[PDB]
Amino acid sequence: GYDRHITIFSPEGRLYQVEYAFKATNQTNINSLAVRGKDCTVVISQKKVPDKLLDPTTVSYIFCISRTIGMVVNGPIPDARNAALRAKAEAAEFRYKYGYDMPCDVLAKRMANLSQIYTQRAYMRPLGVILTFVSVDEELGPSIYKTDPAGYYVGYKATATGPKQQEITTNLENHFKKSKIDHINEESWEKVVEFAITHMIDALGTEFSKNDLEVGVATKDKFFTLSAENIEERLVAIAEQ
Amino acid sequence: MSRDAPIKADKDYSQILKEEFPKIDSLAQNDCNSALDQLLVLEKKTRQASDLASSKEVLAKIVDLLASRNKWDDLNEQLTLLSKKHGQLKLSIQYMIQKVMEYLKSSKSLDLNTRISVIETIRVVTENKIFVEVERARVTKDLVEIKKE
Amino acid sequence: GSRRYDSRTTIFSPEGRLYQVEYALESISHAGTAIGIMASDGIVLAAERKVTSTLLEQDTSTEKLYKLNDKIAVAVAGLTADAEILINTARIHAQNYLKTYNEDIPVEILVRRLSDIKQGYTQHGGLRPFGVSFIYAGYDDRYGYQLYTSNPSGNYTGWKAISVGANTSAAQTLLQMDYKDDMKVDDAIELALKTLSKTTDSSALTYDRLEFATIRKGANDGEVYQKIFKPQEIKDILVKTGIT
Amino acid sequence: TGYDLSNSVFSPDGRNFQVEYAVKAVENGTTSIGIKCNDGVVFAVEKLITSKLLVPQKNVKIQVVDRHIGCVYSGLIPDGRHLVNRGREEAASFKKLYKTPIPIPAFADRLGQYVQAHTLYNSVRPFGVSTIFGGVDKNGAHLYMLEPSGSYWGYKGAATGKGRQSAKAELEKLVDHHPEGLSAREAVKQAAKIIYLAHEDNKEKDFELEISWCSLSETNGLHKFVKGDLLQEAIDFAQKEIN
Amino acid sequence: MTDRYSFSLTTFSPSGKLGQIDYALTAVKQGVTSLGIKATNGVVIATEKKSSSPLAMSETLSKVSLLTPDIGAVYSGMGPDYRVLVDKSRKVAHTSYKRIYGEYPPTKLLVSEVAKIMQEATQSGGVRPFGVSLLIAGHDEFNGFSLYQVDPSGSYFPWKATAIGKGSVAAKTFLEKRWNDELELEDAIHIALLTLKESVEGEFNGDTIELAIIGDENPDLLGYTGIPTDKGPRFRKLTSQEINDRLEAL
Amino acid sequence: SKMSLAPEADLDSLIIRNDSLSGAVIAAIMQEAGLRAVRKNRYVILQSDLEEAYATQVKTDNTVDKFDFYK
């Protein structure tokens, strides 16, 4: 009864707060696709069609954590801002003590520890967001790590999140296993972008425009978004092809 | 797509270059591939409605060559590339392409052509799941006639 | 959220008997039997293990008889996790008193302070209280051997024989008929092992399910010697008495 | 059932149901609009005159943060005042560290953390207020709205309160007709219009029009109230338009 | 801002025995299978490590973690609970351990420290127990190789062989017969992999199967051979190739 | 016995795919398989059909839910 309601271990041992949290992501309906380039990490995502009240050019999903790590957040819009603080703050922490910013793997470890703690106290609850940290680490090269509300985490060759993640997985499965390549072996980062957009349009079935886009590219010792001018220039090549 | 200037703009563009169709046709006499190149830009309309207008011009072309044996290859090969890549969905522009597909099937002009054409034509429509299979099967039957001998 | 919900264990019971403490005695009796028999010349202390699993290395791992220091040994019955914390607390307390005054702590003092910690938990601790009974077998010169047991209540009572754990009544009844005031340590060794076997459902209580210790002043040149008996030494005296 | 009651526990849909309860106050509150214009931002808020016991121009919800950010709010009135205080605390702290005014983007980011903090506490209730805030700074005019649940976005136009339905439907058409924006001066008259359409909704009691503005050219990127001749013409002219 | 709890949420059941200890344990049982055989010249610890999603990197997922360069550990149960408990255990051991001794902790000692921490979680209001069982496998001078099993109840005992998780019942029995007093390092591994196949059939790539031994000492792995009387890391985490090799000699 | 298995592949194929399953599932498999057989107009149950029918019925609470907090 009671056990189930508040945080504490149910009879079954299930954490109901966590199960509900996973439903919560899907409620924003955000879909993502991330692939590994040869020397870049390209992550692209949807953004719901703009309102005339809003400004269409604003973004609030992308957050520059550090030079190395960019982060795209899928889940509750209010909690994404909450999460963005903790990643930057611990990023800077590592610069003082250990003298440089966190790697991608190492930032995931830290958020996961924090997630676990939030679940035990009553007052504190797990952040309902699913966080997608993108980086090119030097040692691991191109890297994506997916960190979960639970405090669960694992790297990916390519990842997908959302209600229609089901469709993207099936497309990427086809893409990457048959070829037999762990990541895209194309050298120019531009052609990784060309091509990740192409897979998004195919897989969910709906064409993207500048307004839905938003292109994140992380490289060695840099995380950048593409200028609006360049977003439109990738569109011309996509259509002809 | 979301942009609605293409709808009007493109309908107008097709019509003015349809009055230029005989110019394209004379250049086609000297070099089909060059007249083909102009039409390729044209059948990359983004909007479907104007695609339908523009796909008329392509239908007219192959009648006048009557009929190519090297240039028609690029054309078969391209239609494939447009549909598989995007086409902006596999169905979106591909109804427009159906009238383009239709012309090979029903032309039946020269025995020389007929043998060669069926192997190339059925290869294209294979992995599509619309009307094309009804056509695809019938032309297959024409190779069976040859195979009887 | 936290205001609404309550799991107060610090209600003053209407029966005069706190309900949580009631259930901790139930839980004690699930854990195996430990028997303190006080003789004029020692305390014979013996406790059966409650595991019986074959893969489990019981031999090595003492889990009930822990030597605190030279004159004081404790037998545990109850929750083993809760028990560990109180073992370290009891060890450090005897050392601190020995340092201040240069005398091994009288038995009385040590037992009282530990009982008062259990008490404290339900007094206003907010804590669930430790669900452990300990027989503290102790010696000091002034008072001879002294035997006390603790309760999850934080109450201790002295005795000349006590039982805790399972078969409290079965064990207690045998010891009353068979033990006489004057039987010496020597008798009590033979007595303890035999009564335990008879209470337990095992056909022969093996040496490997036993733990045995004695605290005796019959160790020469006016000295006190304890020895936690090793499993194979338990075996030889097991054969003599005919259990095996 | 029980997950709902317990503040800051995941509802079985997802997210505590109390945050939704708090939203409802904001609808029941008075109209407040925030307009981004060429020059700057123009705030207007509907101050109901319940009675003539009320003191004209003197039950302002307009509270200056620093000196170049107006803040005005809708919903539960005590809740606002606490969040208002919080903005102040935040602005000054930035000036301790960095010796210069806070930028408006940075203010929007830092205010938002405070809402989240209390709503991952079960012990401390939600805020019952949407805050409209913004001003002109060195980096230009900027308009933000902090929703009750805590979300900040850029806005061409912003609205909260009972009459946001009227406010929204006008602002969409006004931006469609004027995609090059409009001066803050002209928008003094046009704010007045918008509020009149929203007093169809809040038609129960009479009202008093209060505009404040912060404009790049005309208030010189400081925030001050609009009063006297500027305010009078805005009343006079708008009236004619809505007849 | 602290929760207004001021009391232990954990109550004795009215039939004895804490509610919450029982509640925590179920998780260990539900979670996936792990087995270990204690041996005279080593310890084999083995676990299944299934792909979460083929697209997911299946190399970065770990269930083996280091406590000291001599002692490694694997668990079953809640994954996020494990990670934190490891971090606490590094500090509890190392710093304090170095201050009172200045060595690596023997296995017996390390295992006991962990037991108290599990108890304090449970006892403490506002903090629900860690429901994980870890097998801490290690070496010390004075007890040869040792295997302790640490239960979420805050209790430990050493075992000749043990298993936790779903397949524990099946595994324990298989092993029981195969276990000998004298054991080859090579045979302990053959026997371990043989049983592990029966836990869930298929996927016997050495990539998806995580295998470690607390093998014999290496000044090679130590990274200094200038004095090779120093103990090397006793713990070795095996490569995928090594596992592939074991399947042929089984 | 009921209906001679197709000679597409051996009798012995069915045997390999079941690895621990009970009779009840075996029966659900064979039932679906010959239903689809009737459509093709062959009364022999294809060895492909049993292959697809076997393969399916995999659901039974996946690994995603479990692995986020039991693995």
Side-chain angles (χ1 to χ4, degrees):
Chain A
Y2 287 145
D3 289 57
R4 299 188 294 103
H5 288 333
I6 45 156
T7 58
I8 177 171
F9 286 180
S10 65
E12 306 300 300
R14 289 176 188 264
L15 303 183
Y16 279 111
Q17 293 63 44
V18 182
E19 299 169 274
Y20 301 157
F22 285 137
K23 307 181 192 178
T25 303
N26 322 117
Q27 201 162 293
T28 60
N29 296 293
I30 306 180
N31 289 293
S32 38
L33 176 146
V35 284
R36 281 173 59 203
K38 184 51 145 181
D39 54 34
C40 59
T41 306
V42 174
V43 49
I44 58 162
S45 35
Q46 63 181 60
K47 184 172 67 60
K48 307 298 285 184
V49 299
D51 196 308
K52 279 171 189 292
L53 296 186
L54 292 172
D55 297 336
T57 52
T58 62
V59 289
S60 293
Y61 295 111
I62 297 169
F63 302 87
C64 173
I65 291 310
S66 57
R67 190 186 292 99
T68 62
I69 299 170
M71 176 186 80
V72 187
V73 179
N74 316 130
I77 301 192
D79 274 293
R81 293 100 171 100
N82 195 240
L85 177 66
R86 290 176 163 90
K88 291 165 189 182
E90 291 291 356
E93 180 53 24
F94 208 73
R95 179 63 64 80
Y96 193 56
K97 298 291 167 67
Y98 304 85
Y100 60 116
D101 295 349
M102 279 180 182
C104 214
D105 183 67
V106 174
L107 191 67
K109 298 191 157 171
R110 189 62 185 185
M111 292 299 284
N113 287 288
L114 293 167
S115 295
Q116 204 304 114
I117 286 160
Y118 298 168
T119 322
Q120 292 296 337
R121 311 304 296 272
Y123 68 101
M124 294 302 295
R125 57 172 181 92
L127 311 176
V129 289
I130 299 170
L131 302 174
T132 298
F133 297 91
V134 286
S135 198
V136 166
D137 186 83
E138 280 39 57
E139 181 175 357
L140 304 185
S143 48
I144 304 162
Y145 280 86
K146 168 169 188 291
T147 301
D148 289 306
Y152 195 64
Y153 72 95
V154 70
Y156 278 80
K157 296 189 171 186
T159 202
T161 301
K164 297 181 180 179
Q165 83 182 104
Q166 275 315 79
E167 303 181 55
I168 306 169
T169 293
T170 307
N171 192 57
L172 302 179
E173 190 185 11
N174 290 337
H175 181 279
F176 273 116
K177 306 195 182 169
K178 292 179 182 180
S179 45
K180 198 66 172 182
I181 60 172
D182 300 338
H183 49 84
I184 296 170
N185 298 301
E186 185 49 41
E187 291 213 59
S188 179
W189 60 271
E190 310 179 359
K191 296 188 178 184
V192 180
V193 173
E194 189 65 16
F195 184 35
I197 308 178
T198 290
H199 293 331
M200 185 73 80
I201 297 160
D202 299 343
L204 296 176
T206 300
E207 46 76 58
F208 269 18
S209 68
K210 179 176 79 173
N211 287 350
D212 286 348
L213 292 169
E214 47 172 57
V215 184
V217 186
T219 63
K220 299 180 193 300
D221 305 305
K222 193 62 165 184
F223 165 60
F224 55 109
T225 63
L226 302 174
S227 64
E229 295 66 35
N230 281 351
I231 294 167
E232 292 172 349
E233 295 156 47
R234 293 297 71 68
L235 293 174
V236 187
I238 289 170
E240 312 161 303
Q241 273 150 320
Chain B
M1 296 175 179
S2 49
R3 189 181 179 184
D4 62 357
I7 293 168
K8 181 180 187 296
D10 309 3
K11 290 169 199 187
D12 291 314
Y13 286 8
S14 200
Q15 197 58 253
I16 293 169
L17 288 171
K18 195 180 295 195
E19 295 301 294
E20 205 177 102
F21 201 65
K23 173 182 168 63
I24 298 176
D25 296 358
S26 47
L27 288 164
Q29 310 296 302
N30 297 75
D31 185 40
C32 320
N33 274 334
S34 161
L36 182 46
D37 177 69
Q38 171 166 358
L39 293 178
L40 290 183
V41 173
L42 178 64
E43 298 299 300
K44 322 280 166 172
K45 305 310 199 179
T46 304
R47 179 62 166 114
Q48 323 181 221
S50 57
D51 198 273
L52 173 62
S54 69
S55 65
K56 303 302 179 181
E57 290 186 14
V58 198
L59 310 172
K61 178 171 175 287
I62 186 68
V63 193
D64 292 342
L65 302 190
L66 177 97
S68 180
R69 274 305 97 186
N70 309 319
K71 300 99 168 180
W72 81 304
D73 299 71
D74 290 345
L75 179 60
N76 298 332
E77 286 295 317
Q78 176 57 52
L79 300 161
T80 331
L81 292 172
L82 175 58
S83 62
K84 289 181 177 179
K85 194 183 87 197
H86 286 118
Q88 296 182 59
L89 182 64
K90 319 308 183 199
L91 299 176
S92 189
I93 287 172
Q94 280 61 49
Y95 297 150
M96 303 305 99
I97 293 169
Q98 183 66 54
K99 301 306 175 184
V100 174
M101 290 191 288
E102 284 171 5
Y103 174 78
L104 293 175
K105 313 314 182 68
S106 54
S107 183
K108 299 278 180 191
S109 40
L110 303 162
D111 291 300
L112 297 169
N113 294 8
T114 300
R115 179 185 57 260
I116 294 169
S117 297
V118 173
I119 293 167
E120 293 184 35
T121 49
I122 67 189
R123 175 206 58 201
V124 172
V125 300
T126 301
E127 36 60 70
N128 283 317
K129 59 276 151 173
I130 62 171
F131 181 67
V132 296
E133 295 92 64
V134 172
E135 302 180 327
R136 184 270 307 284
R138 177 63 185 83
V139 299
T140 302
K141 184 174 185 295
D142 296 338
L143 300 172
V144 174
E145 309 311 319
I146 311 167
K147 284 173 190 305
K148 301 190 190 189
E149 301 171 40
Chain C
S2 291
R3 189 163 172 92
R4 184 186 293 95
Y5 289 96
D6 289 289
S7 300
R8 300 152 180 193
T9 47
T10 70
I11 51 154
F12 191 106
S13 182
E15 269 83 19
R17 287 168 187 166
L18 183 61
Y19 309 92
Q20 299 281 283
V21 186
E22 310 198 85
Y23 311 149
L25 307 166
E26 294 175 302
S27 298
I28 292 168
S29 201
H30 290 60
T33 307
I35 303 282
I37 301 172
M38 180 176 168
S40 56
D41 292 300
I43 300 171
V44 161
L45 189 59
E48 65 177 356
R49 193 71 63 86
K50 49 168 201 289
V51 280
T52 189
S53 55
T54 187
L55 304 173
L56 191 59
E57 184 88 287
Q58 307 173 81
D59 288 345
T60 58
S61 176
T62 188
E63 298 297 318
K64 312 189 63 162
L65 291 190
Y66 305 102
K67 176 178 183 178
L68 299 183
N69 60 91
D70 288 343
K71 293 178 176 61
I72 313 189
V74 298
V76 176
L79 308 185
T80 72
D82 287 348
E84 297 174 304
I85 314 174
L86 282 174
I87 292 155
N88 294 325
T89 313
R91 278 170 179 178
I92 66 181
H93 291 167
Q95 293 182 47
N96 299 332
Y97 178 86
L98 165 63
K99 283 181 300 182
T100 307
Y101 294 104
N102 297 141
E103 188 183 359
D104 288 348
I105 183 159
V107 197
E108 190 282 298
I109 311 180
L110 189 63
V111 179
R112 182 182 71 231
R113 282 167 66 214
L114 287 167
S115 299
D116 290 346
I117 300 175
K118 300 179 183 192
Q119 291 172 0
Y121 291 148
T122 62
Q123 192 45 230
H124 52 274
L127 292 191
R128 68 189 179 80
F130 286 7
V132 295
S133 289
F134 294 155
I135 299 170
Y136 308 89
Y139 188 66
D140 60 68
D141 287 340
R142 199 69 193 83
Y143 315 118
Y145 289 85
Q146 300 202 95
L147 167 61
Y148 306 114
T149 189
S150 63
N151 298 112
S153 61
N155 184 249
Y156 60 94
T157 299
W159 304 95
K160 192 173 161 53
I162 190 63
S163 179
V164 283
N167 296 319
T168 314
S169 185
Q172 193 58 68
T173 313
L174 300 176
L175 290 173
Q176 269 173 343
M177 298 303 297
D178 302 299
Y179 188 69
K180 306 298 189 295
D181 305 313
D182 72 286
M183 291 181 178
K184 298 296 186 175
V185 172
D186 297 307
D187 303 280
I189 293 167
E190 310 297 286
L191 193 47
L193 297 162
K194 288 184 298 177
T195 62
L196 290 161
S197 43
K198 279 187 209 195
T199 51
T200 193
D201 293 320
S202 195
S203 301
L205 186 57
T206 30
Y207 69 86
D208 64 358
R209 299 166 174 95
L210 289 171
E211 295 182 71
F212 166 44
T214 308
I215 302 173
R216 284 196 86 172
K217 186 58 161 195
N220 295 261
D221 314 293
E223 290 276 264
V224 190
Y225 187 58
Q226 184 179 333
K227 180 178 176 182
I228 309 194
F229 285 98
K230 290 293 172 188
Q232 284 295 109
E233 303 191 68
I234 298 180
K235 180 178 190 191
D236 291 345
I237 69 172
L238 195 77
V239 172
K240 291 178 182 180
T241 49
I243 292 168
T244 39
Chain D
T1 55
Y3 293 95
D4 290 345
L5 293 172
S6 300
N7 181 263
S8 311
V9 178
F10 274 88
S11 295
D13 290 299
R15 195 180 177 98
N16 178 238
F17 204 12
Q18 302 293 311
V19 174
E20 293 76 346
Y21 291 3
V23 172
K24 295 171 184 296
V26 174
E27 190 56 7
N28 292 329
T30 70
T31 314
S32 184
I33 52 188
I35 315 178
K36 193 172 298 191
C37 281
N38 284 346
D39 293 290
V41 284
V42 165
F43 299 124
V45 55
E46 185 175 12
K47 169 180 144 174
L48 294 176
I49 306 302
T50 60
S51 275
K52 297 306 168 175
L53 290 170
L54 290 172
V55 176
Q57 300 181 47
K58 176 68 178 179
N59 289 295
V60 294
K61 304 182 191 53
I62 299 169
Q63 301 281 253
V64 181
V65 164
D66 196 345
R67 58 174 69 199
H68 66 278
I69 303 170
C71 168
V72 66
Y73 63 89
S74 178
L76 299 169
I77 291 287
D79 278 71
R81 290 176 186 270
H82 194 77
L83 196 57
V84 148
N85 296 354
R86 277 287 175 81
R88 303 165 164 161
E89 284 184 352
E90 164 177 309
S93 294
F94 183 106
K95 292 198 284 163
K96 296 184 201 187
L97 302 183
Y98 304 127
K99 282 184 192 69
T100 201
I102 195 172
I104 311 282
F107 184 67
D109 197 46
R110 305 286 85 220
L111 272 181
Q113 306 284 298
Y114 281 136
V115 176
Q116 300 304 309
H118 296 192
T119 55
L120 298 173
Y121 303 160
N122 74 267
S123 47
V124 178
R125 68 176 174 205
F127 282 98
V129 291
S130 199
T131 316
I132 318 185
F133 56 117
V136 177
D137 80 300
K138 56 186 184 187
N139 293 319
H142 279 111
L143 185 68
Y144 289 92
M145 190 154 70
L146 184 73
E147 297 177 351
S149 66
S151 179
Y152 73 89
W153 303 98
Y155 299 82
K156 305 184 176 185
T160 194
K162 189 167 200 170
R164 72 181 74 193
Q165 314 295 143
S166 296
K168 171 175 170 318
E170 190 172 354
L171 271 157
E172 288 174 301
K173 61 168 184 176
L174 178 60
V175 314
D176 197 76
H177 293 301
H178 287 315
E180 75 281 288
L182 33 160
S183 305
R185 202 79 176 77
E186 177 75 16
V188 173
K189 299 178 300 179
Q190 305 306 296
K193 296 178 74 170
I194 293 166
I195 293 289
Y196 308 149
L197 316 189
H199 182 74
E200 301 296 308
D201 305 302
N202 290 319
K203 74 190 185 195
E204 297 69 63
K205 289 298 178 177
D206 53 315
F207 65 169
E208 171 199 293
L209 190 70
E210 285 191 308
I211 291 168
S212 63
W213 67 0
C214 181
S215 43
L216 193 135
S217 61
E218 289 153 292
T219 327
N220 317 102
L222 302 176
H223 184 263
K224 297 188 197 68
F225 291 84
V226 177
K227 52 181 174 189
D229 311 295
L230 299 80
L231 194 70
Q232 286 311 313
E233 298 165 54
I235 293 166
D236 296 343
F237 189 53
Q239 198 180 136
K240 308 174 176 74
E241 295 172 96
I242 63 166
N243 280 131
Chain E
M1 301 297 292
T2 186
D3 34 63
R4 309 307 287 189
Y5 294 137
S6 63
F7 38 80
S8 175
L9 301 181
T10 313
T11 35
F12 288 96
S13 305
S15 44
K17 190 48 179 169
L18 308 308
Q20 184 57 73
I21 296 300
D22 308 328
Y23 292 179
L25 181 58
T26 59
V28 172
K29 308 181 174 191
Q30 286 174 69
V32 316
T33 326
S34 45
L35 43 73
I37 302 93
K38 178 167 74 166
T40 63
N41 47 21
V43 181
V44 63
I45 61 195
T47 196
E48 63 187 72
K49 188 183 75 168
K50 186 174 182 177
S51 177
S52 291
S53 291
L55 296 163
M57 296 296 294
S58 58
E59 300 189 82
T60 63
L61 183 65
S62 303
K63 303 199 67 190
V64 172
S65 305
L66 210 58
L67 302 160
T68 68
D70 284 302
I71 301 171
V74 65
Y75 74 107
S76 177
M78 299 181 200
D81 285 7
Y82 176 73
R83 173 179 60 269
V84 198
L85 190 55
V86 168
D87 304 302
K88 181 69 182 186
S89 311
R90 297 170 181 140
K91 310 164 172 175
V92 169
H94 208 67
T95 63
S96 175
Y97 216 80
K98 292 299 183 180
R99 186 71 183 163
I100 322 161
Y101 241 100
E103 51 187 13
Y104 283 122
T107 319
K108 164 163 69 199
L109 316 190
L110 186 44
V111 164
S112 26
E113 300 176 320
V114 176
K116 185 177 182 184
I117 306 164
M118 297 177 161
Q119 198 286 348
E120 296 183 316
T122 301
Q123 185 64 36
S124 204
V127 179
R128 300 110 57 186
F130 290 96
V132 264
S133 179
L134 288 78
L135 299 178
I136 300 170
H139 188 75
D140 70 18
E141 178 180 353
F142 185 56
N143 293 275
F145 291 84
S146 38
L147 172 63
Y148 292 88
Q149 162 159 72
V150 180
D151 295 339
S153 46
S155 63
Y156 77 94
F157 316 98
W159 304 67
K160 287 175 286 309
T162 194
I164 40 179
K166 60 178 170 183
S168 53
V169 192
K172 280 171 184 173
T173 315
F174 179 110
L175 292 175
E176 184 189 19
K177 179 164 184 68
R178 303 300 198 184
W179 194 87
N180 305 295
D181 293 345
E182 180 174 347
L183 272 162
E184 187 55 277
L185 189 57
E186 280 281 26
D187 289 346
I189 294 169
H190 307 140
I191 301 156
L193 293 170
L194 184 50
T195 303
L196 183 60
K197 288 168 181 183
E198 315 184 319
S199 195
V200 58
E201 297 292 350
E203 289 309 306
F204 301 133
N205 314 313
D207 189 63
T208 50
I209 292 184
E210 185 165 65
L211 196 68
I213 52 181
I214 308 299
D216 304 329
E217 61 174 62
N218 287 90
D220 288 317
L221 285 173
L222 184 48
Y224 61 87
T225 53
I227 301 172
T229 324
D230 298 277
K231 296 195 197 172
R234 277 299 188 145
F235 161 91
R236 185 184 167 204
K237 205 157 108 173
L238 306 174
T239 63
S240 59
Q241 178 61 50
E242 186 54 80
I243 292 169
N244 282 299
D245 293 345
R246 295 310 178 195
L247 285 161
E248 296 176 0
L250 191 177
Chain F
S1 302
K2 294 174 178 156
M3 175 60 67
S4 166
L5 299 183
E8 174 176 59
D10 310 336
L11 173 288
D12 290 344
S13 64
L14 183 58
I15 313 195
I16 297 166
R17 315 171 188 131
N18 193 340
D19 298 317
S20 57
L21 298 175
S22 69
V25 193
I26 300 163
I29 298 159
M30 68 81 185
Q31 186 164 49
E32 287 180 325
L35 178 60
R36 291 178 287 154
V38 170
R39 310 192 300 169
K40 315 170 182 82
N41 303 101
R42 293 176 175 78
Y43 45 64
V44 298
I45 298 170
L46 289 80
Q47 306 303 98
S48 298
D49 308 334
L50 290 167
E51 212 189 343
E52 285 199 332
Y54 172 69
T56 60
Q57 316 196 58
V58 286
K59 303 172 190 178
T60 319
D61 299 293
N62 309 302
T63 64
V64 283
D65 70 302
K66 304 305 176 194
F67 278 10
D68 67 59
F69 73 8
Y70 296 131
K71 190 157 69 171

